[PDB]
Amino acid sequence: EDDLSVEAEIAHQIAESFSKKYKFPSRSILLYNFEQLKMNLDDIVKEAKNVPGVTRLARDGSKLPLRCVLGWVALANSKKFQLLVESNKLSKIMQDDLNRYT
């Protein structure tokens, strides 16, 4: 019941911004979207639930930190993204987005 609501909330927000280009720091700006993952939406949603604080935001119906969620899912799943991204800078950006949204 709770789970269903959390997942629909996350799915709704990711679907709404599926092709929006977010900015990530590169090793050498990396632009990326959810579409580029080439992941099914349910797999993206499952993965997004492990971003600390995201499940709780989704349960409250709050605005998600989507650039952060995308960076995390891409870091965990996309070999290309992992190669291109500056991972330390990414972690700081992800943490700050999370501080701002929670």
Side-chain angles (χ1 to χ4, degrees), residues 2-37 39-78 81-102:
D2 172 72
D3 221 357
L4 262 17
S5 280
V6 165
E7 297 171 340
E9 180 58 47
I10 298 171
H12 147 74
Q13 290 191 43
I14 296 184
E16 175 185 58
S17 305
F18 210 66
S19 56
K20 180 161 171 44
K21 292 294 200 172
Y22 294 100
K23 305 169 171 182
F24 300 96
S26 40
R27 285 190 219 179
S28 307
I29 297 301
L30 165 63
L31 299 181
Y32 209 80
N33 60 28
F34 286 105
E35 187 285 335
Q36 282 172 279
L37 296 165
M39 287 171 70
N40 310 330
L41 183 57
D42 52 307
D43 287 329
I44 295 174
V45 172
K46 191 191 180 144
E47 198 75 73
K49 293 174 74 183
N50 305 322
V51 182
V54 161
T55 286
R56 172 177 299 183
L57 290 164
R59 187 183 320 113
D60 296 352
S62 305
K63 201 171 181 297
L64 297 180
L66 287 182
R67 181 267 300 275
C68 173
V69 167
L70 178 52
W72 177 290
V73 177
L75 173 65
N77 288 270
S78 166
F81 183 89
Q82 175 185 332
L83 175 65
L84 288 171
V85 78
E86 221 275 15
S87 71
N88 202 276
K89 275 174 188 182
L90 184 61
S91 185
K92 304 203 218 274
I93 275 170
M94 286 190 308
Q95 193 46 51
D96 177 74
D97 285 2
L98 284 172
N99 295 340
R100 292 189 296 112
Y101 275 71
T102 55

